[PDB]
C-alpha cells in the first residue's frame, strides 16, 4: 500500500541533512512534509497556467502575451502595500465569469495542494468578492466551489481533507460583512469558520455581527496585525479581546508588543503566518527580518501558509523554502508548526484525529 508522496515521519527527520542538498533536492523534502495549511484564499489560489487559460477562454486580453497577462493582473513581483494588493486582486475578478470556471478553479486548487503534499487544507473565500464583477449569485458560487472540492476529494479517496471558511471583506464593490455573516450561518454545514480580510479595519465596530456568528458555533479567525502602515495595534486588541478569535490571519505585528505576545500565548491563539505575502506586500522589510522567527522563539504558536498562490505565483513549499534558507527553520520546527496547525484547525475533530494518527 503506497501513495505518490512518501510523507516524512517525525522519527525519520534526524536522518535528513538539508545542508547537503541543492534547492531542487530540498523541495522534494518540503513536498514530503505532511502539511496542514490554515490560510489560503481559494478565490486567489491558482497557477500561472490556469490563470492565463481563463483569460484566453473568455478572450479578455487579446492584445497581451501570456507573460504580459501575468504582469497586468498578478502580484508576483510584489508591490508597495496591502492597499496595492487589494486593488490588483479586484482586476483578477475578471476570471469569475461563470460558475463553470469557479468549479474548475476549486478543483485545480485542491488538486495542486494534494500534489504539493498538503494533507489538511482549510480554504477560505469571499462570496461577495467572487460575485461582484459579473453580478453572480452567491448561492450558485458556493454550489460550484463545494461541488469542485467534493469531486476532487472523492477522486483522491480523501487523501487530502479540505474544509471551507467564509470571508466577509472590505475594499471591493458590493462588500458586505453582515450579508457574508448571514450567508456563512445559512451554510454553516459547509463552513468551519468565519473571517475578515481585504483592508485591515478595526473590527470592534462589527462586534455584534461577530458575536452572533461565534455564539452560533462558527469559530473566528480574522486578518489582524498584518498592515504595518497602521498607526497602532488596535485591530489586534479588538480581534483578541472583542472578537475573541481562536486564530489570527497574519498577526505578525504581535511581535512589536510584549503585552500582545503574552496575551496570544495565554489564550492559545495561533498566528497564521504567510511569509512570502508579507515580504511582497512590504509588511515585513525582508525575509531575513520576518517576525515569525522572533514569534517562534517567543513561544507563540505560529503556522506556515501560502495565502494567495495565484496572486504571488508561488505555492506552499516556497514559503517553507524561504523560512529554511533565510531564517534557519528546521524540519523539526516545521513538523511542530504543522501539528499546532492540526490542533487549532476548525475541521471536525473525528477527521483531525485520523490525520494525527496517520502523519503525526
Ligand atoms: N488583508 C489581506 N487580504 C487578502 C490577502 N489575500 C487575499 N485577501 C483578500 O481576501 C479576499 C479574497 O479571498 C479579497 O478581499 C482579498 O483582497 C492578504 O494577504 N491580506
From Swiss-Prot:
<dbReference type="GO" id="GO:0009168">
    <property type="term" value="P:purine ribonucleoside monophosphate biosynthetic process"/>
</dbReference>
<feature type="binding site">
    <location>
        <position position="169"/>
    </location>
    <ligand>
        <name>a purine D-ribonucleoside</name>
    </ligand>
</feature>
<feature type="binding site">
    <location>
        <position position="307"/>
    </location>
    <ligand>
        <name>Zn(2+)</name>
    </ligand>
</feature>
<dbReference type="Pfam" id="PF00962">
    <property type="entry name" value="A_deaminase"/>
</dbReference>
<dbReference type="GO" id="GO:0005829">
    <property type="term" value="C:cytosol"/>
</dbReference>
<keyword id="KW-0378">Hydrolase</keyword>
<dbReference type="GO" id="GO:0004000">
    <property type="term" value="F:adenosine deaminase activity"/>
</dbReference>
<dbReference type="GO" id="GO:0090614">
    <property type="term" value="F:5'-methylthioadenosine deaminase activity"/>
</dbReference>
<comment type="similarity">
    <text>Belongs to the metallo-dependent hydrolases superfamily. Adenosine and AMP deaminases family.</text>
</comment>
<feature type="binding site">
    <location>
        <position position="198"/>
    </location>
    <ligand>
        <name>a purine D-ribonucleoside</name>
    </ligand>
</feature>
<dbReference type="GO" id="GO:0043103">
    <property type="term" value="P:hypoxanthine salvage"/>
</dbReference>
<dbReference type="GO" id="GO:0046103">
    <property type="term" value="P:inosine biosynthetic process"/>
</dbReference>
<feature type="binding site">
    <location>
        <position position="226"/>
    </location>
    <ligand>
        <name>a purine D-ribonucleoside</name>
    </ligand>
</feature>
<dbReference type="InterPro" id="IPR006330">
    <property type="entry name" value="Ado/ade_deaminase"/>
</dbReference>
<feature type="binding site">
    <location>
        <position position="39"/>
    </location>
    <ligand>
        <name>Zn(2+)</name>
    </ligand>
</feature>
<dbReference type="GO" id="GO:0060169">
    <property type="term" value="P:negative regulation of adenosine receptor signaling pathway"/>
</dbReference>
<keyword id="KW-0479">Metal-binding</keyword>
<feature type="binding site">
    <location>
        <begin position="41"/>
        <end position="43"/>
    </location>
    <ligand>
        <name>a purine D-ribonucleoside</name>
    </ligand>
</feature>
<dbReference type="GO" id="GO:0009897">
    <property type="term" value="C:external side of plasma membrane"/>
</dbReference>
<dbReference type="GO" id="GO:0006154">
    <property type="term" value="P:adenosine catabolic process"/>
</dbReference>
<dbReference type="InterPro" id="IPR001365">
    <property type="entry name" value="A_deaminase_dom"/>
</dbReference>
<keyword id="KW-0862">Zinc</keyword>
<feature type="site" description="Important for substrate specificity for S-methyl-5'-thioadenosine">
    <location>
        <position position="169"/>
    </location>
</feature>
<feature type="binding site">
    <location>
        <position position="307"/>
    </location>
    <ligand>
        <name>a purine D-ribonucleoside</name>
    </ligand>
</feature>
<keyword id="KW-0660">Purine salvage</keyword>
<dbReference type="InterPro" id="IPR006650">
    <property type="entry name" value="A/AMP_deam_AS"/>
</dbReference>
<feature type="region of interest" description="Gating helix loop; regulates binding affinity for substrates and thus substrate selectivity">
    <location>
        <begin position="167"/>
        <end position="181"/>
    </location>
</feature>
<feature type="binding site">
    <location>
        <position position="250"/>
    </location>
    <ligand>
        <name>a purine D-ribonucleoside</name>
    </ligand>
</feature>
<protein>
    <recommendedName>
        <fullName>Adenosine deaminase</fullName>
        <ecNumber>3.5.4.4</ecNumber>
        <ecNumber>3.5.4.31</ecNumber>
    </recommendedName>
</protein>
<feature type="binding site">
    <location>
        <position position="41"/>
    </location>
    <ligand>
        <name>Zn(2+)</name>
    </ligand>
</feature>
<dbReference type="GO" id="GO:0006166">
    <property type="term" value="P:purine ribonucleoside salvage"/>
</dbReference>
<comment type="function">
    <text>Catalyzes the hydrolytic deamination of adenosine to produce inosine. Unlike mammalian adenosine deaminases, also catalyzes the deamination of 5'-methylthioadenosine (MTA), a by-product of polyamine biosynthesis, to produce 5'-methylthioinosine (MTI). Plays an essential role in the purine salvage pathway which allows the parasite to use host cell purines for the synthesis of nucleic acids.</text>
</comment>
<comment type="pathway">
    <text>Purine metabolism; purine nucleoside salvage.</text>
</comment>
<feature type="binding site">
    <location>
        <position position="223"/>
    </location>
    <ligand>
        <name>Zn(2+)</name>
    </ligand>
</feature>
<dbReference type="GO" id="GO:0046872">
    <property type="term" value="F:metal ion binding"/>
</dbReference>
<dbReference type="InterPro" id="IPR032466">
    <property type="entry name" value="Metal_Hydrolase"/>
</dbReference>
Amino acid at each position: 500500500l503506497q501513495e505518490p508522496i512518501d510523507f516524512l515521519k517525525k522519527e525519520e527527520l534526524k536522518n535528513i541533512d538539508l545542508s547537503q542538498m541543492s534547492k531542487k533536492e530540498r523541495y522534494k523534502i518540503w513536498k514530503r512534509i505532511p502539511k496542514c495549511e490554515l490560510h489560503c484564499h481559494l478565490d486567489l489560489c491558482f497557477s500561472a497556467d490556469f490563470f492565463v487559460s481563463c483569460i484566453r477562454k473568455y478572450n479578455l486580453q487579446p492584445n497581451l502575451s501570456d507573460e504580459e497577462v501575468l504582469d497586468y493582473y498578478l502580484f508576483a513581483k510584489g508591490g508597495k502595500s496591502l492597499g496595492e494588493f487589494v486593488e490588483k486582486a479586484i482586476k483578477v475578478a475578471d476570471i469569475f465569469h461563470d460558475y463553470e470556471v469557479i468549479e474548475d478553479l476549486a478543483k485545480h486548487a485542491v488538486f495542486n495542494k494534494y500534489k504539493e503534499g498538503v494533507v489538511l487544507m482549510e480554504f477560505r473565500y469571499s462570496p461577495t468578492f467572487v460575485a461582484f464583477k459579473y453580478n453572480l449569485d452567491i448561492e450558485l458560487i458556493h454550489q460550484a466551489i463545494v461541488k469542485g472540492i467534493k469531486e476532487v476529494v472523492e477522486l483522491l479517496d480523501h487523501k487530502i481533507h479540505v474544509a471551507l471558511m467564509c470571508i466577509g471583506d472590505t475594499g471591493h464593490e458590493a462588500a458586505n460583512i453582515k450579508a457574508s455573516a448571514d450567508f456563512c450561518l445559512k451554510h454553516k454545514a459547509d463552513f468551519v469558520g468565519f473571517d475578515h480580510g481585504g483592508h485591515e479595519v478595526d473590527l470592534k465596530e462589527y462586534k455584534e455581527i461577530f458575536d452572533y456568528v461565534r455564539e452560533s458555533g462558527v469559530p473566528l479567525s480574522v486578518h489582524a496585525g498584518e498592515d504595518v502602515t497602521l498607526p497602532n495595534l488596535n485591530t489586534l486588541y479588538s480581534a483578541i479581546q472583542v472578537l475573541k478569535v481562536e486564530r489570527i490571519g497574519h498577526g505578525i505585528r504581535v511581535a512589536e508588543s510584549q503585552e500582545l505576545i503574552d496575551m496570544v500565548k495565554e489564550k492559545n491563539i495561533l498566528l497564521e503566518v504567510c511569509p512570502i505575502s508579507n515580504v511582497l506586500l512590504k509588511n515585513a522589510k525582508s525575509m531575513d527580518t520576518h517576525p515569525i522567527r522572533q514569534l517562534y522563539d517567543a513561544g507563540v504558536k505560529v503556522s506556515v501558509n501560502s495565502d494567495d498562490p495565484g496572486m504571488f505565483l508561488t505555492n506552499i513549499n516556497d514559503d517553507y523554502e524561504e523560512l529554511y534558507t533565510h531564517l534557519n527553520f528546521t524540519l523539526e520546527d516545521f513538523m511542530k508548526m504543522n501539528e499546532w496547525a492540526l490542533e487549532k484547525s476548525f475541521m471536525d475533530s473525528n477527521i483531525k484525529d485520523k490525520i494525527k494518527n496517520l502523519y503525526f
